[PDB]
Each structure stands twice: as C-alpha cells, then as structure tokens.
Design an enzyme around this catalytic site. Structure first.
Site, mmCIF file in Angstrom:
data_model
loop_
_atom_site.group_PDB
_atom_site.id
_atom_site.type_symbol
_atom_site.label_atom_id
_atom_site.label_comp_id
_atom_site.label_asym_id
_atom_site.label_seq_id
_atom_site.Cartn_x
_atom_site.Cartn_y
_atom_site.Cartn_z
ATOM 1 N N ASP B 21 0.492 -0.460 2.056
ATOM 2 C CA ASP B 21 -0.515 0.416 1.456
ATOM 3 C C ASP B 21 -1.407 1.050 2.526
ATOM 4 O O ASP B 21 -2.626 1.158 2.384
ATOM 5 C CB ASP B 21 -1.345 -0.346 0.417
ATOM 6 C CG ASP B 21 -2.114 0.578 -0.508
ATOM 7 O OD1 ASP B 21 -1.473 1.273 -1.323
ATOM 8 O OD2 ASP B 21 -3.359 0.612 -0.416
ATOM 9 N N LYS B 24 2.831 4.558 4.671
ATOM 10 C CA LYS B 24 4.182 4.699 5.210
ATOM 11 C C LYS B 24 4.964 5.787 4.478
ATOM 12 O O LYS B 24 5.551 6.682 5.102
ATOM 13 C CB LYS B 24 4.918 3.361 5.117
ATOM 14 C CG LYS B 24 4.221 2.210 5.824
ATOM 15 C CD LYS B 24 4.833 0.874 5.437
ATOM 16 C CE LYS B 24 6.324 0.853 5.715
ATOM 17 N NZ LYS B 24 6.932 -0.455 5.353
ATOM 18 N N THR B 25 4.987 5.718 3.144
ATOM 19 C CA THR B 25 5.718 6.704 2.354
ATOM 20 C C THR B 25 5.105 8.089 2.504
ATOM 21 O O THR B 25 5.824 9.088 2.642
ATOM 22 C CB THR B 25 5.742 6.285 0.884
ATOM 23 O OG1 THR B 25 4.400 6.200 0.390
ATOM 24 C CG2 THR B 25 6.420 4.934 0.731
ATOM 25 N N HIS B 62 6.406 -5.444 2.397
ATOM 26 C CA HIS B 62 6.046 -6.681 1.720
ATOM 27 C C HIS B 62 6.761 -7.854 2.380
ATOM 28 O O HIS B 62 7.915 -7.727 2.801
ATOM 29 C CB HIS B 62 6.401 -6.606 0.234
ATOM 30 C CG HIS B 62 5.696 -7.623 -0.607
ATOM 31 N ND1 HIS B 62 5.960 -7.792 -1.950
ATOM 32 C CD2 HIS B 62 4.730 -8.521 -0.300
ATOM 33 C CE1 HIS B 62 5.191 -8.752 -2.430
ATOM 34 N NE2 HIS B 62 4.436 -9.211 -1.450
HETATM 35 N N1 LIG Z 1 -8.055 8.749 3.779
HETATM 36 C C1 LIG Z 1 -6.788 8.558 4.219
HETATM 37 N N2 LIG Z 1 -5.905 7.927 3.403
HETATM 38 C C2 LIG Z 1 -4.626 7.709 3.791
HETATM 39 C C3 LIG Z 1 -4.209 8.172 5.123
HETATM 40 N N3 LIG Z 1 -2.913 7.836 5.256
HETATM 41 C C4 LIG Z 1 -2.533 7.213 4.111
HETATM 42 N N4 LIG Z 1 -3.555 7.134 3.238
HETATM 43 C C5 LIG Z 1 -3.502 6.523 1.887
HETATM 44 O O1 LIG Z 1 -2.315 5.739 1.736
HETATM 45 C C6 LIG Z 1 -1.801 5.889 0.409
HETATM 46 C C7 LIG Z 1 -0.276 5.885 0.417
HETATM 47 O O2 LIG Z 1 0.187 4.544 0.562
HETATM 48 P P1 LIG Z 1 1.761 4.203 0.569
HETATM 49 O O3 LIG Z 1 2.462 4.889 1.717
HETATM 50 O O4 LIG Z 1 2.388 4.596 -0.747
HETATM 51 O O5 LIG Z 1 1.792 2.602 0.755
HETATM 52 P P2 LIG Z 1 2.886 1.902 1.706
HETATM 53 O O6 LIG Z 1 4.251 2.488 1.436
HETATM 54 O O7 LIG Z 1 2.912 0.414 1.449
HETATM 55 O O8 LIG Z 1 2.509 2.149 3.146
HETATM 56 C C8 LIG Z 1 -2.364 7.190 -0.143
HETATM 57 O O9 LIG Z 1 -2.911 6.974 -1.447
HETATM 58 C C9 LIG Z 1 -3.458 7.607 0.819
HETATM 59 O O10 LIG Z 1 -4.710 7.694 0.132
HETATM 60 C C10 LIG Z 1 -5.230 8.852 5.955
HETATM 61 O O11 LIG Z 1 -4.954 9.275 7.098
HETATM 62 N N5 LIG Z 1 -6.459 9.002 5.447
#
Ligand SMILES: Nc1nc2c(ncn2[C@@H]2O[C@H](COP(=O)(O)OP(=O)(O)O)[C@@H](O)[C@H]2O)c(=O)[nH]1
Ligand SMILES: C/C=C\C=C\[C@@H]1O[C@](O)([C@H](CC)C(=O)NC/C=C\C=C(/C)[C@@H](OC)[C@@H](C)[C@@H]2O[C@H](/C=C/C=C/C=C(\C)C(=O)c3c(O)cc[nH]c3=O)[C@H](O)[C@@H]2O)[C@H](O)[C@H](O)C1(C)C
Ligand SMILES: [Mg+2]
Ligand SMILES: [Mg+2]
Ligand SMILES: [Mg+2]
Ligand SMILES: [Mg+2]
Ligand SMILES: [Mg+2]
Ligand SMILES: [Mg+2]
Ligand SMILES: [Mg+2]
Ligand SMILES: [Mg+2]
Ligand SMILES: [Mg+2]
EC number: 3.6.5.3
Lengths: 146, 371, 205
Positions: B21, B24-25, B62
RNA sequence: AGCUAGUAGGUGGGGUAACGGCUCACCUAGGCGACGAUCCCUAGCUGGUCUGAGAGGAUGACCAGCCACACUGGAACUGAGACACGGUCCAGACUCCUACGGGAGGCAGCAGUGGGGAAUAUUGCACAAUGGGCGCAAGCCUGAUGCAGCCAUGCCGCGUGU
RNA sequence: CCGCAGAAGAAGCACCGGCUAACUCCGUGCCAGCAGCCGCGGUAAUACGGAGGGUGCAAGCGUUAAUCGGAAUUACUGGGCGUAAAGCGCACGCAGGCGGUUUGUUAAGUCAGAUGUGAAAUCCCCGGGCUCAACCUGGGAACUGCAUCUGAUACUGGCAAG
RNA sequence: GGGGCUGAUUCUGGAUUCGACGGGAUUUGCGAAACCCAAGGUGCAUGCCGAGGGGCGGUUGGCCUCGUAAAAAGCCGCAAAAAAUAGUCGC
C-alpha cells in the site's frame, strides 16, 4: 465392549488384566472413538515382553491416501517383568495362548485387554484329506488313455 | 493472439516488490502510461523501451504471498523497491530485500514515493540515506545505484515535470540493467508457474523458459508431480502476441494439446523428450552457517521436515546424514541425503532453498541423484 | 516373430526326431539328452487326452517355424478345401517357402532357411521375395541370386544337403543354385512321426 | 378392453400438379376390435454383422438404399423440385454487442473448446486424380473426396539373428 | 532398388492342485493372503508372498463389459406334468381347434412347369494383382422370398348328394 | 495463489506412561569401564630400535622376532629340478 466374537465362540477367555500399549500418532485418535480390528489378535513371544501382534489398525479415513497409516507397525504390550519367560513356558507346554480381546479406555489410554486363551483343536479333516488323496489319485490314474 | 511480435530489443524482466500500500500498482501503471504516451496477484504488464523491451511484474508485497513471490523474483531480472519517503524502511521492506538477496536478484533500483507530500528538502535526503545505509549493510550495492524520488500517482495526472522524471527513471533502469545472459544452449526446458484454459484454444501453461528454444509444432514432455507424460505444442505466444520461436529467459505462455486443468498443476516442467527424469531422493551439500545466516540457534537433531523450494514450487522433505555427525546443529557445511514426496525433474548443480516457519534456514546444491 | 532360444531343451521337452542343428558336436546320448538317466529323468506324466494333441501341434509349429495364429489360419483353409484336412495342412506347411529352401538344402536348418529368405538369399521364378510364408505352386522354379552365391552360409548348407535322402518333388542343381518344384507331397512320403487327426480333433473342439 | 364421431360412407362445391373428409353444407349411424381395437413403455427400418451344422438368438459397429431432423415450436413465400442443413417471419430459453437510439447468433459439416464418460483424432495439404455445381471455353471453388498426423483399436506380414 | 560399419538398433504377458499345458524351495501359520467353480491356507502350502525352474500365447498378453453356443435350461426340428417345478375341485357351453364312410363338382390349402424379381455391396466357388497375405477385384452360384400364366385332384377344405 | 476451518480426551496449566529411551541420585550385596594403587610373593625387571634369520617357490625389515651382538624363526603353499593332486584320477 469389543468382545472378540471369535475368541468368544471358540476357547472362552480365562485370564486377563489391564494395561495400555505404545503407539505413534498415526495409529491413534481413532481408538478414542472406538473403531478398530482386534479380532483374534495373534500375540506371540517377543523379547520386549511379548510385543502386541496380530491386530491391525482401524480402516478409518485418517489415511494420507498412500496407506491407512501403517500396514505393519510395532505395537508394544506392557508388563514390568511377570510374563516373558512364564508366557514362553505356558505357550510351550500348557496350551494357553495369550491374545488381545478388547480396547477399554481410561478416557486417555487405549487399554490392551489381552486374554490368555486355550489353544483349541482343529476340526477332524480326516475326510477331506482322503478326498484330496482320491482326487490326486484320479488325476494320476488317467495314464492309460490314447 | 493477433499481433506478430518482433524479437527486437531483447526481453528483460523487471519486478516491483515494494512496500504494501505504498503505490506499486500505481507506479507501474504510471510507467506504462508515460512510456506508451511518449513512445507510442502478479500483474505482468509490458512496455517497449527504445533500448530494451521490458516485462514489468508487480508482485504481491504481502508476507503470506511469499511462496509465489519467490518464483516472481526468481523470474525477475531487476528489482524495484517501491517505498514511501515519509515512512522510510519498514519490516516488510526488510523482509522483501532479504528474500530478494536469498533468491539472487543482482540489480535493484530504489524509488521514493510521496515526494511532494513532504514540504522539505532534508527529510527526503534523510530517508534516502537511511535506505542506502540499509542496502549497504544488508549486502547490497551502494553509491553506484540510481535512486529515484518522485510521485507515483501524479505521474498519471496532467503534468510535465514528473513525466520527465519518470522518463528519466525508465532510462537509467534500462541503462543500469544491461543485456542479460541467456542459456539457449541445452535442449528446451520451461518450469510451469500458472495454467489458463482458453475456450476454443485449450490449456496454456505460463513460465520463464529455463533453457532451449521452442518451435511451433514441437513435441515436449511434461515431467513433475506424480506424472511423466508427453504432449504437443501448437501456437507459441507471449503476452497475447503471435510468436515463432521462444528463447530462454522471458515469461511466455505455451499452448499444450491434450491437457487437463486439474491433471496439470504448478511445479512441473516442459522439457525436451529424454532429457530429465523425476526423482524423490537425492544427495546435496548444505551451506548453513552458525547463527547469522537464517539458520536457527538451538542444536536441532534428525527428523527435520523443512520445505525445499525449487525453481517452481516447494515440498516438505526429510534429511538423513552419514555417520560422523551425531547432531545436525546449525553450521552444516556437510553433505546429506534429502528425500521428497513429490518427484520433480532435477539435474546436478541445482540450487534449492531450505525454509521453515516462514524463514530461510540455509541453501543446498544438488550433488547426485538417488531416484 | 520367429521363435528364438534354446533348441536341445526344446526338443527334449517332447522327445522325438523332430530335427537337429546343422552342425554336429557330440550329438548322442552322452549322459542326459532327452531321456536323462541317473537319479532322475521323469519324461512323461502320461496325460489322458488333448495333451498329446497339444504336444503334436506344438512340435509341428516349432518344426515349421509357424506361429499359432497362422497355423490355425492354415488349418481353417485346409478344412475349407477338399480332401483330408491333415494332408492339406501338411501340404500348406511344406509349401511355405522356408521349408522349401530347407528341403532343397540351401537352408542348413529351418531357422537358417527363414533367415536367408528374410535376408533375400532366395528368389522365385526370377523374382526376390522376403516372406517365409510364401506358398509355392507346382511346376515352378526357385533360384538363388548371385549375391548369395559367395556365402560360406550356402556352401555349408549345400554340403550338408547331400548327406540326407532326397524328396519326390524337388530337383536342385548346385552348379546354378536352382531348384525345380514339380509336385506336392503326401502323407506317404512325409515322415510318419505324428498323427494328423488328433490335431484336427483339437481345433475342431 | 373398448375407441372414434370429421369419425364410416354417400350427395355437390371448394381445394391439390392427381385420387381421397383434404375441407365445407346436408343426409345416412356406422367404422375399427379378442387375428388385440384404444392406451402405456421402447425403438430408426432394410441389405446385412456376430454367434451358431441347422432351425434359431442378439444387433443394426464400417459401407449402401430409404425415412425423419437441423436450439425448442409454429407458419408461409421463392423455386418444377422445401415448409428449406451454412433462404424468410414469429413465440420461448440461452449467449453476445451497443453510443442504451437499438442489432446478431444457432457446429446432430469439417476441425477445434467447456461438461459427461470405461473410453475414442489435427483448428493440416490439395483440387494432383474422380465426382459436384457454374460457365462457349480456358477457368472458379468443393472440410465431397484423395492424402498427410495420433492411437497396437482390429486383421495380416516381417524382424530381435544362423 | 542399389551401396554403407557392425548383430551391431529392436520381447513382453499370463499360468504352473482337477477342470487345462506346466514342479521344487524359503517365510508366514484360518493370519497375511489367491480364486470362475471344486475349493486352499490351523508347521511342514507344487494352490498364499517371494525365488528358482517349466508351460501357453507372442508386439502383443491378462481382467472386465455385451451376444450366442455348450443350456435339449422356453426344446417348432427338440422337454415334462403320480411321488423333483407341473392336471384347473367338478360339470355345461360360445367364439376357436379338429373331425366317421362313399360319389360328383370347384382349384382354396398343397404339388409341378415358366416368367419377372430378390439394388449394389457382403458370405461362398472358380481366377487374378498388390514380395504371398491382410486387402482389392472379374465371372458364376446363392440370397431358400414375393407375384403372375397353365396343369395335377391323392390328401385337408368350399359346394351339391348319400 | 490466498482467507476461514479440523489435526483427541471438559483449547489437560502434571501420569511412575508399573514395563519402551540415554542411562542413572541413594546405599551397596561387586571385581578396573561402575570406582585407583600394585600394601604376597615374583626383578632374570619399569622400559626403546635403525634392525637382522624357516624344510621345495614369494614376502607385507613385519600379525614371526632381539635384550637389538646380528641369530635360534612365522605368513603364503604346487609353478621347477621339489612333498605338483609323478602332466589330463599313466595322478
Ligand atoms: N500522496 C501520494 N500518494 C501516493 C503516492 N504514491 C502512491 N500513493 C498512494 O498509494 C495508493 C496505491 O497503492 P497500491 O499500489 O494499490 O498498493 P500496493 O500495490 O500494495 O503498493 C494510492 O491510493 C495513492 O494514494 C505519492 O507519491 N503521493
Ligand atoms: C528464498 C527462497 C527461495 C529461493 C529460491 C532458490 O534460491 C537459491 O537456491 C539460493 C541459493 C544461492 C538459496 O538457497 N537461497 C535461500 C536460502 C539461503 C540463503 C542465502 C542465499 C544466504 O546465503 C547462505 C544469503 C543471504 C547470503 O548471505 C550473505 C550475507 C548475509 C546477509 C544478511 C542476512 C541474513 C541471512 C541474516 O540472517 C541477518 C543478519 O545477519 C543480520 C540482520 N538480519 C538478518 O536477517 C550474502 O548476502 C548471501 O546472499 C537460488 O538462488 C535459486 O536460484 C532459487 C531462486 C531457485
Ligand atoms: Mg367432392
Ligand atoms: Mg430413442
Ligand atoms: Mg452451422
Ligand atoms: Mg445351440
Ligand atoms: Mg436354446
Ligand atoms: Mg424337463
Ligand atoms: Mg409336486
Ligand atoms: Mg382332478
Ligand atoms: Mg387349490
């Protein structure tokens, strides 16, 4: 009660006591429920105080789909020192053969209710032996045929 | 299955195994969008850099998904540590870097999200120094690694500065990851990692070609758990694109004829006929150290039942040792014999991983085979 | 699938003059050949019926090299034809090309004749054949091609040929390796070492 | 163990490429059925195939003739020849597409996929030969066909040696 | 088809107490276990498991699935009903089945002759070609059936007389 | 590929499991392996060799061996003239 109907209909039990036995986790946890196959357990002389023989393990679905748990596994009877040499002598010159009868529980231990039963004599096969001899004579006397 | 793929700009695999979270995606989606704009579960997206064509694997970060993540990282040729610059290193990040080092990922690039969420010019440098120190202390490269700061979600928002920054990120990714080595010398071999059932097409098996090439119409052999059988390939493809031959080192999906979804599971290998034979017991030398190499502390004894992870999957196994070793106390540089339940086609020199309780105990190299 | 393996044991299983190996190395009753004397030697359980018929079928098949299915096909053809089923069966067995070569002498043993026929050491009417099951018709000529002339294989076979007697229907010259097959044999000329109607009874069963 | 009243027939019209309750109006109250009527279950039939000395019994694998069918059902048109197997209309189920204004579909054809099963095939090559239809004709195409792939599924032959 | 090195590159399955072709040992000891039946296996198993050795088929061997045969065990050819299964508890009687003796007449049943036909394919016979065969193919017979024309009048039957 | 869930008995907050497994406190009824000296005599003795030697043919300076001066001898045996199983039972 696991009365061992074979040992009931033939050679009534005469002497027994209460003792557990040693086993692994594979062949256990089903004797707590009751399922087992202890019909005419052929317990013979073993150096380790006549280790339990004859009776197999219950066919309950505890299998790893390879075998049930153990087609042949060591089962140990329990006696400090009272019946090793005496049991050997009784089997040799008395006619009493100790067999396992029932599986009672102290709610934890599956007790080996081994019973010392008398060796009963076989049925008179003095008719079927002669029948077999006549059959083989008939099979052999077919020589003069061309 | 409607695009004839050209084998130019050799395929390179890049995987994002960053923090949970932390974007990454979003980061990989932004990279794909900006590259496709300026140039015209494990998520396997692709993009064609002017230097090399890359397949980006967004792996689940995870802890419970570590089993498939092992293959995703072994599948991977270059790692991208995706982390927030407002929180710094995390236990999950440390576990991920330990797993990457244990699987053997050579090149890693660090990316710092939430650059604009911090209105300062010192905290970003502090967290960058912290992660660099962590890398340098956990047996990773140092000041010769491109470290990337910037926003991962604003790269998709209408801008120019972050678009240029992410383009520069892609550039040194392709610069710092040179032409990888491929092993197309021996006959064809491909470990399976996923199975799909195409209606009207059949069963297809996905994976990275370990060695050799696969031409359309070639016979191959399925070797693996409980089964060694034969089959025929028809329609080699890669990322829903038409192919002619499949080299080694790239993640492709091979179509098999006469394949049952339940009959074929993950863990098997598509090899050339008569090449490898499955075995259930084999001799291997272990490389466990005393205490500071994953191995436990107390001197455990025989009967140990660890999971022996391989190129594809793992299995619970038993270990027996020759006489001369009363205990199997950690510090085992000796050779022993490992017996496994599920047979897997193996060869000499294979490197496997010994794991237990969610942690790696030691490594092992196959020495001989006892079938 | 021609039979292959032991031959002395095969012959002594029945006990007959079936035929022997072309080479001779102390072929006699030295100590134990077919009716082994000394401390053992039970030869015949003396089976009541159908056993002697099975033995006759087996010895016929192993002498001629034919398998059970082909032998039964030949029996069915003989029964379908006229005359006597046994003689028609024997006529087909002798008309099998391998036995023709063996009785002409180019085959040292029947197995050797089959080997030569397979290896194309034989030709019929100026045409090669590599089938040991070919049936020859009366008034025909079977030659040996020039390649098989230079075989110590054939030289020894033709040397051993003239130690036996000669048949009613084959006339062979070794100056050209050619033999004329004129007529078909009969039970009178055929060796009287087996019974045909017992075999007829067995497969009519 | 009774069925049937357009049901049995006749008188005329209509209808059919032709006979006829095929249909209409009227009249006669019969017609079928113990040789099984009516009703229920099952079933493609035949030449043939297997097993039998024979009469018999089982069955309709390959191939040929005939019948019926084309998601289920109903209806009609074109056309000499259909209620139409890759023509049309409509009721129902299912599936798909849509810009949500609205459209398409029926592999019991060749292949091929999902499910079932004790269990059975390649998404090939060619009009090269025959045949098919079209055309002055060269010529078009044919998943008919012929050849190719896998399977010892069945028959036959040869070989592992003398 | 001609050349090329070397047997050099190619054998398994089932069974072995009687039915049925095949015998010894070791170990377990109504236990483990084989099997279609008879039936084995309670210390000495040619029958169980293994081993040795023999037999039957062989790139095919065994189990199972279905038909007939042996089953004369649905028997028309070709069963039986006192005691094995089987004479209704008895009687009357319709439809139905059969029917004493002689004559004439009908040609219905029956018999004979002839015609067409029984598609082709397939079984079979005489031949032919694929290295013989499997396979394909020429001719012939058969497909015992069916209908029609003419005779036979012994028998059953229609009609007329006794 | 992941989440939940069942891996005995009232999630046993104790079983000598009377007998199984490495061996053990306690006393001893025991001698060197349960636990040391040599308290009765006995020196041909505590204690060491580079080392050198049989009846037919070889030898692991020795599993034979010397109080080490260089000698009294073990282990393999049938190949020769030897006791070769006088060659193949001319044994
Ligand atoms: N404010 C901010 N939020 C970020 C940034 N990069 C990612 N996010 C947050 O990360 C979330 C996406 O998470 P996700 O990739 O789906 O989770 P993961 O796959 O477990 O890494 C989004 O809702 C963004 O709000 C950033 O540079 N600035
Ligand atoms: C991880 C599981 C899956 C791996 C799959 C297989 O791994 C492999 O078989 C692999 C064989 C090399 C393998 O078995 N790995 C799996 C198993 C074995 C683990 C391998 C490698 C190690 O060496 C003993 C490896 C860490 C090694 O340590 C060195 C330095 C130490 C680093 C510190 C971290 C460690 C440990 C640690 O305990 C530690 C610490 O000390 C301080 C603080 N906190 C810590 O936590 C260096 O960095 C080397 O890389 C191959 O890479 C195959 O290709 C594979 C991918 C199929
Ligand atoms: Mg009218
Ligand atoms: Mg039906
Ligand atoms: Mg269609
Ligand atoms: Mg019959
Ligand atoms: Mg019958
Ligand atoms: Mg009867
Ligand atoms: Mg009665
Ligand atoms: Mg009466
Ligand atoms: Mg009554």
């Amino acid at each position: 009660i696991a009365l061992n109907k074979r040992a009931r209909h033939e050679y009534f039990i005469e002497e027994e006591f209460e003792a557990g036995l040693a086993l692994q986790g594979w062949e256990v946890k089903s004797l707590r429920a009751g399922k087992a196959n202890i019909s005419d357990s052929y317990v013979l002389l073993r150096d380790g105080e006549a280790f339990l023989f004859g009776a197999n393990i219950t066919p309950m679905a505890v299998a790893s789909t390879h075998v049930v748990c153990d087609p042949t596994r060591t089962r140990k009877l329990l006696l400090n020192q009272r019946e090793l040499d005496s049991l050997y002598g009784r089997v040799n010159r008395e006619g009493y053969t100790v067999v396992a009868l029932s599986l009672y529980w102290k709610n934890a231990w599956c007790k080996v209710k081994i019973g010392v039963a008398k060796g009963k004599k076989q049925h008179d096969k003095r008719s079927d032996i002669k029948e077999r001899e006549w059959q083989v004579d008939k099979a052999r006397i077919m020589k003069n045929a061309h | 299955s409607k695009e004839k793929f050209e084998r130019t700009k050799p395929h390179v695999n890049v995987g994002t195994i960053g923090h949970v979270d932390h974007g990454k995606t979003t980061l990989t989606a932004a990279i794909t969008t900006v590259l496709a704009k300026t140039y015209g579960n494990t998520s396997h997206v692709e993009y064609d850099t002017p230097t090399r064509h890359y397949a980006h694997v967004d792996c689940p970060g995870h802890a419970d998904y570590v089993k498939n993540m092992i293959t995703g990282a072994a599948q991977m040729d270059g790692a991208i540590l995706v982390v927030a610059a407002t929180d710094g290193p995390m236990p999950q990040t440390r576990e991920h870097i330990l797993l990457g080092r244990q699987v053997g990922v050579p090149y890693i690039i660090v990316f710092l999200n939430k650059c604009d969420m911090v209105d300062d010019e010192e905290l970003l440098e502090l967290v960058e120094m912290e992660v660099r120190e962590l890398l340098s202390q956990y047996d990773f490269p140092g000041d010769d690694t491109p470290i990337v700061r910037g926003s991962a979600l604003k790269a998709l928002e209408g801008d120019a500065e972050w678009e240029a920054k992410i383009l520069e990120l892609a550039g040194f990714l392709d610069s710092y990851i040179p032409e990888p080595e491929r092993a197309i010398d021996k006959p064809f071999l491909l470990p399976i990692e996923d199975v799909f059932s195409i209606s009207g097409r059949g069963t297809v098996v996905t994976g990275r070609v370990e060695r050799g090439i696969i031409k359309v119409g070639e016979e191959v052999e399925i070797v693996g758990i409980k089964e060694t059988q034969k089959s025929t390939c028809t329609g080699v493809e890669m990322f829903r694109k038409l192919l002619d031959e499949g080299r080694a080192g790239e993640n492709v999906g091979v179509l098999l004829r006469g394949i049952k979804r339940e009959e074929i599971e993950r863990g098997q290998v598509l090899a050339k006929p008569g090449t490898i034979k499955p075995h259930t017991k084999f001799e291997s030398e272990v490389y466990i150290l005393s205490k500071d190499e994953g191995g436990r502390h107390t001197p455990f004894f025989k009967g140990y039942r660890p999971q022996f992870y391989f190129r594809t999957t793992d299995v619970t196994g038993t270990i027996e040792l020759p006489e001369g070793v009363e205990m199997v106390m950690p510090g085992d540089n000796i050779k022993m014999v490992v017996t496994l339940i599920h047979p897997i086609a193996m060869d000499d020199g294979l490197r496997f991983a010994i794991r237990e309780g969610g942690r790696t105990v030691g490594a092992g190299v196959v020495a001989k085979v006892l079938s | 699938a021609r039979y292959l393996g032991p031959k002395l044991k095969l012959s002594r299983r029945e006990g007959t003059d079936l035929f022997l190996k072309s080479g001779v190395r102390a072929i006699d009753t030295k100590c134990k050949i077919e009716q082994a004397p000394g401390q053992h030697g039970a030869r015949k359980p003396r089976l009541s019926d159908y056993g002697v018929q099975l033995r006759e079928k087996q010895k016929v098949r192993r002498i001629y090299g034919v398998l059970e299915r082909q032998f039964r096909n030949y029996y069915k053809e003989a029964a379908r034809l006229k005359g006597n089923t046994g003689e028609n069966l024997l006529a087909l067995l002798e008309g099998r090309l391998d036995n023709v070569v063996y009785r002409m002498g180019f085959g040292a043993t029947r197995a050797e004749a089959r080997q030569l026929v397979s290896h194309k050491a034989i030709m019929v009417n100026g045409r090669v054949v590599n089938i040991a099951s070919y049936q020859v018709s009366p008034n025909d000529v079977v030659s040996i091609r020039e390649k098989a002339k230079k075989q110590s294989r054939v030289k020894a076979a033709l040397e051993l040929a003239e130690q036996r007697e000669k048949p009613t229907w084959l006339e062979v010259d070794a100056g050209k390796m050619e033999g004329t097959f004129k007529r078909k044999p009969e039970r009178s000329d055929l060796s009287a070492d087996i019974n045909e109607h017992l075999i007829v009874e067995l497969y009519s069963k």
